[PDB]
Amino acid sequence: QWAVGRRWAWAALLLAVAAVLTQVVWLWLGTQSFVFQREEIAQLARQYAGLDHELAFSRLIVELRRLHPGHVLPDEELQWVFVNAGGWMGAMCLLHASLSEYVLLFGTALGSRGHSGRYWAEISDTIISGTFHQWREGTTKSEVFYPGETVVHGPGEATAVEWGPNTWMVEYGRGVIPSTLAFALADTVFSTQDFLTLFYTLRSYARGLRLELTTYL
Amino acid sequence: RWAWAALLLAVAAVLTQVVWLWLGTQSFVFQREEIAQLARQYAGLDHELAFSRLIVELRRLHPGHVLPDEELQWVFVNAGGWMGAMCLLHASLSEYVLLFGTALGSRGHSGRYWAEISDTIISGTFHQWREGTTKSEVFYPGETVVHGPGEATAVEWGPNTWMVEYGRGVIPSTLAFALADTVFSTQDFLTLFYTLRSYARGLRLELTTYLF
Amino acid sequence: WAVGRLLLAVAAVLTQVVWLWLGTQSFVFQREEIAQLARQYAGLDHELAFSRLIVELRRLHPGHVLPDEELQWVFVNAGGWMGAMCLLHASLSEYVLLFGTALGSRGHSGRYWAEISDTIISGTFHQWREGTTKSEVFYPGETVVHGPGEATAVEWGPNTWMVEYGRGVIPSTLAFALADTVFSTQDFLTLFYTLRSYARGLRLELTTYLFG
Ligand SMILES: O=C(NC1CCN(Cc2ccccc2)CC1)c1ccc(I)cc1
Ligand SMILES: O=C(NC1CCN(Cc2ccccc2)CC1)c1ccc(I)cc1
Ligand SMILES: O=C(NC1CCN(Cc2ccccc2)CC1)c1ccc(I)cc1
């Protein structure tokens, strides 16, 4: 009459949890929570552009630690490593690294030119010192960005880039990050053969990834 | 059973003789001086207007051998360490006419081709360092620089350098070099596709005009 | 007496033939010998300096410098930079070559299992050490040493020419110098030239070692 078979009820809950679980994973994926904001890294780095890049970097790192404790690499794991990709060369200092985000210090003391690359991500560069030249695809003119300005590099977009002597910046990336190192290490494999740098980069990502997991606990 | 291979080779032998004859009776749409003198006259203009003026004039002199506006496209070129942009106007198996240059400037290996490459400069500078030499030469707007087949030099484009380029030789082979960095350095396969497509479009045009 | 189912027997022999090998190693040039000599010719026109240096080098070490018929400028592409080299001496452990550019270049120094010192005859040499955010500049007369394992970013100005002496596991350094030649320029001809240059250095050294 008002009863329910205990056998039918057992299967109903299994169809229920299947329905609930499939709904739960979409809501969580949709949430898309990010640790940093695109305009925040740009606004924060703009303040230190007036200083010499050495003092600016050290001051910026200190500020970024107190804002987001547990999301920045410790001093013992901070390290400059060269970056060779797209035919240009620079140097990075990884500050933050997840599977969806990264924040790093980038720049050159000699300057360099090359292919920007096409990433499955959106990358924002804010100039602390020097110059950033950009040549968008399909155009015959270039633009130049000075200290205080920010150049954003959309996903799937390819440009030509040029850095002037002693150019430095704070960079924020957002997207499928492990796919980004695929381009960042292309010239390192086939042009420079610098496997020690290759180790440094992967170690920095790993130590950056380790931090994010343990902070989660 | 040995008669099967004979017929397969006989029909292969005759087709090879057809190709050989056809390759021998070939005539060229464009002349070497034709492109050089036509370019030099627009070199005094800004490169944007120089290009558009030249394209139209090239269409007027050789109708059916220049790509339509809907198939014109700037595509990045990455080879020999340097980087520039290209816009293909004409392309067969033996000839090509394109616009080339860079808004930033670039340096690298000239590349060794199975072709003769001629570049008349509209703007900027072209620096050349010939193999075996310890001095460089510079070419300015209005001048034409010639890169012979087999030759390898070191090249340097100053900022905002542009040129009209006419190539004559085994054109499908030159593609091999121009996409070398694209595979091993830039990994820009979208650009690779753009390049191969613009070539196909050029081949399609020449084929249709030939057949009507 | 029987032993059941050698490394100890093998390890002893191999280490004590390697240590015996390291002790019988003899270098043709001193660590600073090339640098002192090259320093004397800096400031001259690089072609004059090179010729004078080659004569003096042949005089100081007969049997270890390549003949005029085996001297050649070959393009070098590696780490994103491009230059030209003239090999003068080459073994498995040492090499002496003339290096430079007419246009200038920028790239990766490379990580060698060898120590490399460069004495500038003309131009400028910019060096950016790893882990630093500043660069240093060397002018004609100065010597830049590249220690084993070290990696820097280097830059040559237009008409920068130098004398280079390297010491260490030389064949491994050749792997780096041919990197861009193989994967970027596809210039097999230069790849042939360089390997031939190395072979000729090795041939001379083998002959000189055997028959004095
Ligand atoms: O070194 C990295 N990434 C490069 C590529 C983006 N910039 C250069 C650039 C290119 C185009 C437009 C703006 C800036 C410099 C940093 C990197 C290191 C570790 C991880 I984990 C992920 C990335
Ligand atoms: O990308 C192409 N060609 C390169 C190599 C020659 N450069 C000019 C140059 C560079 C160095 C020395 C001389 C001339 C322009 C870019 C190319 C694209 C489509 C077809 I179809 C055929 C070739
Ligand atoms: O081409 C060679 N080597 C390159 C890289 C080292 N120097 C250039 C240089 C780059 C960075 C810092 C200092 C010097 C000379 C050019 C080479 C050729 C034949 C043999 I056998 C061994 C090496």
XYZ file of C-alpha atoms and ligand atoms in Angstrom:
710
model
C 0.000 0.000 0.000
C 2.338 2.717 1.284
C 5.298 0.358 1.467
C 8.533 0.246 -0.513
C 10.495 -2.850 -1.475
C 13.887 -2.762 0.227
C 15.422 -4.128 -2.987
C 13.993 -1.371 -5.180
C 14.960 1.259 -2.609
C 18.586 0.131 -2.655
C 18.786 0.693 -6.410
C 16.949 4.015 -6.150
C 19.638 5.471 -3.889
C 22.325 4.283 -6.301
C 20.554 6.058 -9.145
C 20.214 8.985 -6.744
C 23.904 9.279 -5.824
C 24.807 8.855 -9.495
C 22.483 11.755 -10.284
C 23.757 13.875 -7.393
C 27.450 13.114 -7.965
C 27.358 13.939 -11.687
C 25.708 17.231 -10.753
C 28.207 17.915 -7.967
C 31.320 17.636 -10.145
C 29.959 20.166 -12.660
C 29.198 22.740 -9.974
C 32.705 22.424 -8.537
C 34.328 22.611 -11.978
C 32.144 25.614 -12.775
C 33.165 27.465 -9.601
C 36.612 28.018 -11.155
C 38.154 29.608 -8.063
C 41.504 31.293 -8.716
C 44.132 32.239 -6.140
C 45.241 35.442 -7.873
C 43.440 38.103 -9.888
C 44.600 39.219 -13.335
C 44.323 42.916 -12.492
C 45.742 42.371 -8.995
C 49.184 41.195 -10.117
C 49.242 44.064 -12.619
C 48.217 46.629 -10.007
C 50.664 45.284 -7.424
C 53.642 45.215 -9.797
C 52.921 48.747 -11.034
C 53.815 50.138 -7.600
C 57.413 48.880 -7.657
C 58.224 49.799 -11.271
C 59.842 53.027 -10.059
C 62.528 51.227 -8.062
C 65.569 49.438 -9.456
C 64.429 45.929 -10.348
C 66.571 44.277 -7.668
C 65.000 46.197 -4.770
C 61.605 46.087 -6.491
C 61.630 42.297 -6.826
C 62.658 41.750 -3.199
C 60.031 44.213 -1.968
C 57.367 42.721 -4.232
C 58.045 39.163 -3.038
C 57.711 40.225 0.602
C 54.354 41.875 -0.121
C 53.048 38.879 -2.078
C 53.807 36.520 0.804
C 51.665 38.270 3.408
C 48.801 38.686 0.944
C 48.685 34.996 0.039
C 50.459 32.927 2.718
C 51.168 29.349 1.666
C 50.908 30.051 -2.058
C 54.419 31.406 -2.530
C 57.679 29.463 -2.617
C 60.023 29.877 0.394
C 63.425 31.593 0.111
C 65.266 28.264 0.072
C 63.385 27.300 -3.092
C 63.688 30.587 -4.989
C 65.952 30.276 -8.023
C 66.736 32.044 -11.297
C 66.729 29.654 -14.240
C 67.260 30.540 -17.909
C 64.373 30.260 -20.375
C 64.939 29.379 -24.028
C 61.882 29.206 -26.291
C 60.650 30.569 -29.617
C 64.186 31.666 -30.431
C 64.380 34.202 -27.615
C 66.146 33.794 -24.277
C 65.362 35.066 -20.796
C 65.337 34.070 -17.136
C 62.540 33.076 -14.769
C 62.019 33.000 -11.022
C 59.022 30.851 -10.117
C 56.995 32.272 -7.222
C 53.749 30.324 -7.628
C 52.755 27.256 -9.648
C 49.586 25.173 -9.789
C 47.927 23.186 -12.570
C 45.907 26.273 -13.508
C 47.990 29.274 -12.412
C 51.517 30.630 -12.161
C 53.259 33.830 -11.082
C 56.906 34.415 -11.974
C 59.588 37.054 -12.423
C 60.895 37.273 -15.981
C 63.445 39.362 -17.869
C 66.731 39.828 -19.732
C 69.956 41.756 -19.169
C 70.964 41.630 -22.830
C 67.557 41.662 -24.489
C 66.147 39.127 -26.936
C 63.766 38.580 -29.871
C 61.644 35.627 -30.977
C 58.293 33.873 -31.356
C 55.773 34.530 -28.580
C 54.163 31.094 -28.853
C 50.592 29.791 -28.749
C 49.518 28.693 -25.269
C 46.397 27.041 -23.871
C 46.457 29.907 -21.381
C 46.229 33.670 -20.879
C 49.493 35.377 -19.930
C 49.905 38.883 -18.510
C 53.227 40.718 -18.364
C 53.707 43.956 -16.442
C 56.942 45.826 -17.131
C 59.064 46.816 -14.123
C 61.948 48.141 -16.217
C 63.219 48.146 -19.798
C 60.991 47.796 -22.858
C 58.535 45.287 -24.317
C 57.914 45.308 -28.073
C 54.964 43.406 -29.540
C 54.223 42.637 -33.194
C 50.704 41.209 -33.537
C 50.017 38.584 -36.219
C 48.546 39.937 -39.450
C 49.903 43.433 -38.846
C 52.932 45.308 -40.184
C 53.374 47.607 -37.200
C 54.678 46.991 -33.690
C 53.787 48.432 -30.292
C 56.036 49.230 -27.345
C 55.205 48.916 -23.642
C 57.051 50.849 -20.933
C 57.474 50.450 -17.127
C 54.023 50.584 -15.553
C 52.246 49.259 -18.632
C 50.861 45.740 -18.987
C 50.824 43.579 -22.107
C 48.349 40.684 -22.071
C 48.796 37.670 -24.347
C 45.525 35.941 -25.191
C 45.215 32.163 -25.689
C 45.807 30.849 -29.204
C 47.339 34.187 -30.145
C 50.812 34.314 -31.697
C 52.931 37.470 -31.837
C 56.554 38.487 -32.306
C 58.254 39.752 -29.164
C 61.325 41.876 -28.456
C 62.869 42.809 -25.122
C 65.247 45.740 -24.744
C 68.442 45.644 -22.662
C 67.833 45.260 -18.917
C 64.088 44.589 -19.121
C 62.274 43.014 -16.164
C 58.663 42.183 -15.347
C 56.159 40.386 -13.128
C 54.206 37.724 -14.997
C 50.895 36.012 -14.273
C 49.716 33.022 -16.294
C 46.343 31.262 -16.296
C 45.270 28.082 -18.086
C 46.458 24.549 -18.821
C 49.881 25.194 -17.291
C 51.577 21.799 -17.837
C 51.008 22.359 -21.571
C 52.810 25.694 -21.299
C 56.167 24.178 -20.334
C 56.002 22.193 -23.581
C 56.823 25.354 -25.541
C 59.013 26.899 -22.837
C 61.452 23.987 -23.101
C 61.429 23.490 -26.881
C 64.629 25.432 -27.633
C 66.131 24.108 -24.396
C 65.868 20.610 -25.860
C 66.741 21.195 -29.515
C 68.883 24.353 -29.539
C 70.729 24.742 -26.236
C 70.655 21.104 -25.066
C 70.738 22.538 -21.537
C 69.324 19.631 -19.540
C 70.484 21.059 -16.212
C 68.194 24.021 -16.851
C 65.514 21.516 -17.852
C 65.919 19.865 -14.450
C 65.787 23.205 -12.621
C 62.543 24.195 -14.338
C 60.784 20.883 -13.698
C 62.044 20.850 -10.112
C 60.726 24.375 -9.570
C 57.322 23.337 -10.913
C 57.375 20.234 -8.709
C 58.373 22.195 -5.606
C 55.693 24.684 -6.587
C 53.174 21.882 -7.050
C 54.177 20.214 -3.779
C 53.516 23.470 -1.915
C 49.992 23.785 -3.301
C 49.004 20.265 -2.288
C 50.394 20.508 1.270
C 48.871 23.952 1.791
C 45.587 22.311 0.828
C 45.966 20.096 3.916
C 53.946 -13.277 -64.120
C 56.911 -11.153 -65.205
C 54.694 -9.413 -67.764
C 52.782 -7.604 -65.012
C 55.827 -5.577 -63.938
C 56.759 -4.697 -67.524
C 53.403 -3.041 -68.203
C 53.520 -1.220 -64.867
C 56.957 0.133 -65.764
C 55.970 0.879 -69.367
C 53.131 3.108 -68.182
C 55.579 4.495 -65.638
C 58.262 5.077 -68.269
C 55.932 7.038 -70.538
C 54.574 9.211 -67.718
C 58.122 10.040 -66.641
C 58.886 11.072 -70.223
C 55.766 13.252 -70.212
C 56.824 14.945 -66.966
C 60.357 15.437 -68.300
C 59.120 17.039 -71.519
C 56.574 19.189 -69.687
C 59.277 20.358 -67.262
C 61.448 21.280 -70.230
C 58.927 23.308 -72.201
C 58.152 25.468 -69.149
C 57.932 29.260 -69.482
C 57.955 31.742 -66.605
C 55.158 34.194 -65.856
C 57.397 36.742 -64.168
C 60.788 38.108 -65.138
C 63.589 38.787 -62.661
C 63.993 42.439 -63.657
C 60.207 42.819 -63.969
C 59.666 42.433 -60.218
C 62.789 44.395 -59.313
C 61.944 47.471 -61.379
C 58.279 47.360 -60.413
C 59.222 47.254 -56.727
C 61.869 49.999 -56.872
C 59.274 52.506 -58.077
C 57.043 52.037 -55.019
C 59.965 51.960 -52.578
C 59.622 55.712 -52.056
C 56.117 55.216 -50.682
C 55.098 53.887 -47.281
C 55.218 50.091 -47.354
C 51.466 49.706 -46.822
C 50.668 51.699 -49.958
C 53.671 50.299 -51.822
C 52.377 46.760 -51.338
C 48.781 47.509 -52.369
C 49.892 49.500 -55.418
C 52.268 46.740 -56.502
C 49.715 43.946 -56.082
C 47.239 45.739 -58.344
C 49.908 46.475 -60.959
C 51.057 42.849 -60.792
C 47.456 41.754 -61.374
C 47.192 44.102 -64.346
C 50.375 42.846 -66.009
C 49.662 39.176 -65.317
C 45.948 38.429 -64.878
C 45.165 34.970 -63.517
C 48.569 34.567 -61.887
C 47.963 36.648 -58.776
C 45.905 35.437 -55.809
C 42.519 37.102 -55.123
C 42.094 39.417 -52.117
C 40.103 36.749 -50.255
C 43.161 34.478 -50.259
C 45.798 37.067 -49.346
C 47.089 36.633 -45.800
C 50.049 37.587 -43.612
C 51.715 34.494 -42.165
C 54.655 34.314 -39.753
C 57.880 32.777 -41.028
C 60.299 31.175 -38.570
C 63.492 29.717 -40.018
C 67.254 29.786 -39.526
C 66.830 31.577 -36.217
C 65.184 34.663 -37.704
C 61.521 35.688 -37.822
C 59.480 37.647 -40.355
C 56.052 37.816 -41.991
C 55.089 36.787 -45.519
C 52.225 37.402 -47.937
C 52.154 35.113 -50.958
C 51.026 36.653 -54.257
C 51.974 33.894 -56.704
C 53.146 30.292 -56.413
C 53.820 27.517 -58.899
C 56.325 24.674 -58.917
C 59.008 26.967 -60.339
C 58.111 30.531 -59.327
C 56.848 32.538 -56.383
C 56.193 36.204 -55.647
C 55.710 37.295 -52.043
C 55.960 40.272 -49.715
C 58.303 39.795 -46.757
C 59.679 41.660 -43.754
C 59.625 42.374 -40.033
C 58.383 45.184 -37.793
C 60.891 44.345 -35.057
C 63.982 43.333 -36.999
C 65.726 39.962 -36.932
C 68.983 38.074 -37.470
C 69.769 34.549 -38.611
C 70.882 32.012 -41.210
C 69.987 32.827 -44.825
C 69.308 29.168 -45.538
C 70.529 27.115 -48.483
C 67.887 26.727 -51.171
C 67.461 24.957 -54.491
C 66.386 28.314 -55.908
C 67.402 31.874 -56.741
C 65.906 34.448 -54.388
C 65.725 38.137 -55.290
C 64.713 40.793 -52.762
C 64.082 44.401 -53.732
C 63.921 46.573 -50.621
C 61.040 48.977 -50.024
C 61.914 50.077 -46.501
C 64.344 49.399 -43.676
C 67.726 47.741 -44.154
C 69.100 44.393 -45.278
C 72.450 43.300 -43.888
C 74.316 40.462 -45.564
C 77.344 38.508 -44.363
C 78.576 36.209 -47.136
C 80.112 32.847 -46.185
C 83.905 32.977 -46.057
C 84.009 36.750 -45.614
C 84.674 38.808 -42.480
C 82.910 41.969 -43.644
C 79.213 42.698 -44.133
C 77.354 44.579 -46.860
C 74.181 46.639 -46.467
C 71.327 47.171 -48.919
C 68.973 50.152 -48.706
C 65.443 50.851 -50.099
C 65.269 50.712 -53.888
C 68.097 48.183 -54.126
C 67.794 44.475 -54.921
C 69.769 41.780 -53.128
C 70.270 38.407 -54.797
C 70.621 35.114 -52.955
C 72.034 32.493 -55.308
C 71.226 28.778 -55.051
C 73.415 26.820 -52.639
C 74.741 30.050 -51.157
C 74.506 30.556 -47.400
C 74.905 33.934 -45.698
C 74.175 35.574 -42.358
C 71.291 38.020 -42.657
C 70.143 40.936 -40.501
C 66.969 42.973 -40.968
C 66.774 46.339 -39.258
C 63.539 47.479 -37.605
C 60.643 47.995 -40.041
C 62.234 46.377 -43.100
C 60.032 45.275 -46.007
C 60.643 43.852 -49.473
C 59.201 42.279 -52.611
C 60.606 38.815 -53.197
C 60.794 36.768 -56.382
C 62.022 33.184 -56.263
C 62.817 30.818 -59.110
C 63.707 27.161 -58.568
C 62.437 23.965 -56.957
C 59.877 25.855 -54.873
C 58.350 22.911 -52.957
C 61.804 22.262 -51.463
C 62.202 25.789 -50.054
C 59.222 25.058 -47.783
C 61.316 22.520 -45.924
C 63.608 25.158 -44.464
C 61.019 27.886 -43.815
C 59.131 25.577 -41.447
C 62.158 24.069 -39.690
C 61.967 26.314 -36.620
C 58.173 26.037 -36.755
C 58.468 22.340 -35.876
C 61.392 22.353 -33.430
C 61.327 25.845 -31.905
C 57.973 27.625 -32.078
C 55.767 24.517 -32.329
C 53.318 26.788 -34.155
C 51.342 24.231 -36.149
C 48.544 26.714 -36.808
C 51.078 28.771 -38.770
C 52.321 25.625 -40.508
C 48.778 25.001 -41.741
C 48.376 28.613 -42.862
C 51.578 28.326 -44.883
C 50.735 25.025 -46.568
C 47.250 26.316 -47.383
C 48.492 29.531 -48.995
C 50.736 27.373 -51.179
C 47.830 25.122 -52.168
C 45.787 28.199 -53.047
C 48.588 29.415 -55.300
C 48.859 26.032 -56.992
C 45.076 25.859 -57.423
C 45.026 29.263 -59.132
C 47.798 28.455 -61.595
C 46.140 25.137 -62.431
C 42.728 26.670 -63.153
C 44.057 29.540 -65.284
C 46.022 26.917 -67.216
C 42.959 24.740 -67.836
C 40.173 27.339 -67.789
C 87.844 -24.749 -3.689
C 84.876 -23.364 -5.637
C 83.104 -19.995 -5.720
C 79.359 -19.707 -6.340
C 77.521 -17.397 -8.730
C 83.735 -10.189 -10.210
C 82.941 -6.483 -9.954
C 85.661 -6.152 -7.310
C 88.127 -7.714 -9.736
C 86.905 -5.415 -12.509
C 86.503 -2.194 -10.493
C 90.137 -2.249 -9.343
C 91.531 -2.457 -12.882
C 89.340 0.199 -14.496
C 89.860 2.902 -11.872
C 93.622 2.396 -11.828
C 93.918 2.626 -15.622
C 91.823 5.798 -15.619
C 93.905 7.434 -12.878
C 97.009 6.311 -14.755
C 95.493 7.904 -17.848
C 94.739 11.204 -16.116
C 98.348 11.347 -14.968
C 99.833 10.837 -18.419
C 97.677 13.558 -19.964
C 99.779 16.172 -21.712
C 98.414 19.471 -23.003
C 99.989 21.216 -25.994
C 99.072 24.709 -24.781
C 99.029 26.182 -21.286
C 95.841 27.416 -19.618
C 96.891 31.016 -20.271
C 99.369 30.611 -23.139
C 96.872 31.364 -25.904
C 95.433 34.304 -23.952
C 98.796 36.051 -23.546
C 99.652 35.614 -27.215
C 96.281 36.802 -28.523
C 96.365 39.803 -26.184
C 99.464 41.044 -28.029
C 97.639 41.345 -31.352
C 94.438 42.945 -30.078
C 93.725 46.400 -31.474
C 94.988 45.556 -34.944
C 92.720 44.980 -37.918
C 91.276 41.542 -37.165
C 92.548 40.086 -40.461
C 96.081 41.315 -39.761
C 95.914 40.128 -36.158
C 94.743 36.675 -37.229
C 97.504 36.205 -39.795
C 100.241 37.348 -37.413
C 98.841 35.088 -34.696
C 98.776 32.022 -36.942
C 102.413 32.532 -37.922
C 103.473 32.907 -34.293
C 101.346 29.927 -33.234
C 102.945 27.763 -35.922
C 106.350 28.963 -34.726
C 105.753 28.200 -31.047
C 104.151 24.791 -31.600
C 105.144 23.159 -34.899
C 103.003 20.142 -35.779
C 99.904 21.345 -33.933
C 98.494 24.028 -36.231
C 96.504 23.280 -39.392
C 98.069 24.230 -42.779
C 96.895 27.107 -44.994
C 95.203 24.588 -47.289
C 93.113 23.363 -44.343
C 92.044 26.735 -42.977
C 88.437 27.738 -43.617
C 85.720 29.984 -42.214
C 82.668 27.894 -41.355
C 79.339 29.198 -40.059
C 78.384 28.050 -36.573
C 74.796 27.921 -35.367
C 74.086 27.048 -31.739
C 72.001 28.246 -28.798
C 70.218 30.713 -31.059
C 73.346 32.601 -32.063
C 75.305 32.470 -35.300
C 79.012 32.989 -35.907
C 81.963 31.852 -37.995
C 84.917 29.724 -36.902
C 88.398 28.962 -38.185
C 89.809 25.874 -36.487
C 93.564 25.985 -35.894
C 94.123 23.127 -33.433
C 91.912 20.194 -32.402
C 92.320 17.033 -30.328
C 90.006 15.100 -28.017
C 91.053 17.355 -25.147
C 92.064 20.716 -26.644
C 91.123 23.096 -29.433
C 92.155 26.525 -30.718
C 89.968 28.445 -33.161
C 89.261 31.917 -34.496
C 85.673 32.984 -33.818
C 83.511 36.028 -34.498
C 80.661 37.755 -36.326
C 80.343 40.659 -38.740
C 76.712 41.325 -37.836
C 76.666 40.494 -34.143
C 74.592 37.809 -32.447
C 72.856 36.662 -29.261
C 72.203 33.267 -27.682
C 73.031 30.565 -25.128
C 76.669 29.943 -24.130
C 76.026 26.212 -23.727
C 76.937 23.945 -20.822
C 80.219 22.201 -21.595
C 82.274 19.508 -19.923
C 85.214 21.753 -20.745
C 86.834 25.078 -19.902
C 86.713 27.742 -22.600
C 88.549 31.066 -22.658
C 88.041 33.810 -25.246
C 90.406 36.728 -25.859
C 88.782 39.601 -27.761
C 90.680 40.937 -30.801
C 87.958 43.428 -31.751
C 84.334 44.386 -31.093
C 82.509 43.819 -27.807
C 81.626 40.761 -25.727
C 78.602 40.950 -23.419
C 78.229 38.216 -20.811
C 75.272 37.578 -18.509
C 76.102 35.092 -15.746
C 73.444 32.658 -14.531
C 71.729 33.673 -11.303
C 72.584 37.330 -11.862
C 70.502 40.241 -13.163
C 73.396 42.245 -14.598
C 75.689 41.881 -17.596
C 79.400 42.610 -18.020
C 81.202 43.923 -21.087
C 84.616 42.903 -22.398
C 86.587 45.046 -24.850
C 89.543 44.198 -27.156
C 92.468 42.902 -25.105
C 90.335 41.268 -22.429
C 89.850 37.547 -21.839
C 86.571 35.871 -20.900
C 86.768 32.441 -19.279
C 83.866 29.983 -19.454
C 84.217 27.414 -16.678
C 82.868 23.856 -17.041
C 79.204 23.441 -16.127
C 78.613 27.184 -16.312
C 75.827 28.625 -18.450
C 75.604 32.274 -19.464
C 73.787 34.477 -21.962
C 76.237 35.930 -24.469
C 76.134 38.798 -26.958
C 78.556 39.848 -29.676
C 78.568 43.305 -31.221
C 79.104 43.978 -34.940
C 82.679 43.135 -35.991
C 83.504 41.240 -32.803
C 86.429 38.867 -33.344
C 88.284 36.749 -30.810
C 90.740 33.932 -30.210
C 89.321 30.937 -28.387
C 91.033 28.117 -26.518
C 89.024 25.231 -25.099
C 90.091 22.348 -22.868
C 88.088 19.327 -21.704
C 85.870 16.677 -23.303
C 85.934 18.402 -26.701
C 83.730 15.972 -28.704
C 80.842 16.767 -26.345
C 81.232 20.497 -27.018
C 80.858 19.737 -30.719
C 77.398 18.364 -29.921
C 76.306 21.828 -28.792
C 77.918 23.751 -31.664
C 75.937 21.720 -34.206
C 72.583 21.922 -32.424
C 70.971 24.662 -34.520
C 72.755 23.450 -37.636
C 70.848 20.177 -37.340
C 67.436 21.272 -36.067
C 67.136 24.867 -37.295
C 69.144 25.671 -40.424
C 69.313 22.125 -41.825
C 72.583 23.255 -43.412
C 74.170 19.835 -43.871
C 76.956 21.469 -45.871
C 78.207 23.416 -42.844
C 77.634 20.270 -40.788
C 79.959 18.528 -43.232
C 82.481 21.375 -43.114
C 82.710 21.416 -39.316
C 83.046 17.641 -38.940
C 85.694 17.740 -41.663
C 87.516 20.527 -39.807
C 87.506 18.416 -36.655
C 88.707 15.337 -38.524
C 91.633 17.284 -39.993
C 92.667 18.532 -36.563
C 92.504 14.971 -35.277
C 94.479 13.685 -38.257
C 97.312 16.166 -37.695
C 97.433 15.373 -33.988
C 97.500 11.632 -34.652
C 100.335 12.021 -37.169
C 102.305 14.398 -34.948
C 101.872 12.090 -31.957
C 102.923 8.973 -33.850
C 105.726 10.219 -36.103
C 106.751 13.421 -34.324
O 59.111 30.365 -18.344
C 57.905 30.139 -18.441
N 57.092 30.785 -19.291
C 57.629 31.840 -20.161
C 56.698 32.146 -21.345
C 55.937 33.433 -21.075
N 56.847 34.594 -20.951
C 57.266 35.117 -22.259
C 56.203 35.692 -22.936
C 55.837 35.196 -24.178
C 54.773 35.771 -24.855
C 54.077 36.837 -24.300
C 54.446 37.332 -23.056
C 55.512 36.758 -22.374
C 58.084 34.247 -20.231
C 57.846 33.090 -19.304
C 57.310 29.180 -17.635
C 58.076 28.590 -16.638
C 57.520 27.631 -15.804
C 56.194 27.264 -15.970
I 55.371 25.818 -14.710
C 55.422 27.854 -16.966
C 55.979 28.816 -17.802
O 58.892 31.480 -46.187
C 59.306 31.407 -47.342
N 60.525 31.814 -47.721
C 61.444 32.344 -46.700
C 62.902 32.267 -47.162
C 63.285 33.458 -48.012
N 63.067 34.681 -47.229
C 63.733 35.844 -47.828
C 65.114 35.699 -47.778
C 65.742 35.380 -46.576
C 67.122 35.232 -46.537
C 67.872 35.404 -47.696
C 67.248 35.722 -48.897
C 65.868 35.869 -48.935
C 61.616 34.853 -47.110
C 61.063 33.762 -46.209
C 58.504 30.854 -48.324
C 57.127 30.872 -48.147
C 56.297 30.313 -49.106
C 56.851 29.725 -50.235
I 55.597 28.885 -51.670
C 58.231 29.697 -50.407
C 59.064 30.259 -49.447
O 81.911 26.050 -33.006
C 82.405 25.609 -31.970
N 82.150 26.099 -30.747
C 81.235 27.240 -30.585
C 80.903 27.488 -29.118
C 82.149 27.921 -28.365
N 82.772 29.114 -28.970
C 81.875 30.284 -28.934
C 81.606 30.689 -27.635
C 80.297 30.705 -27.175
C 80.027 31.111 -25.873
C 81.064 31.503 -25.034
C 82.374 31.490 -25.496
C 82.643 31.084 -26.798
C 83.128 28.822 -30.367
C 81.882 28.495 -31.162
C 83.275 24.537 -32.037
C 83.752 24.173 -33.289
C 84.625 23.106 -33.418
C 85.017 22.401 -32.289
I 86.330 20.794 -32.514
C 84.537 22.763 -31.032
C 83.662 23.836 -30.901
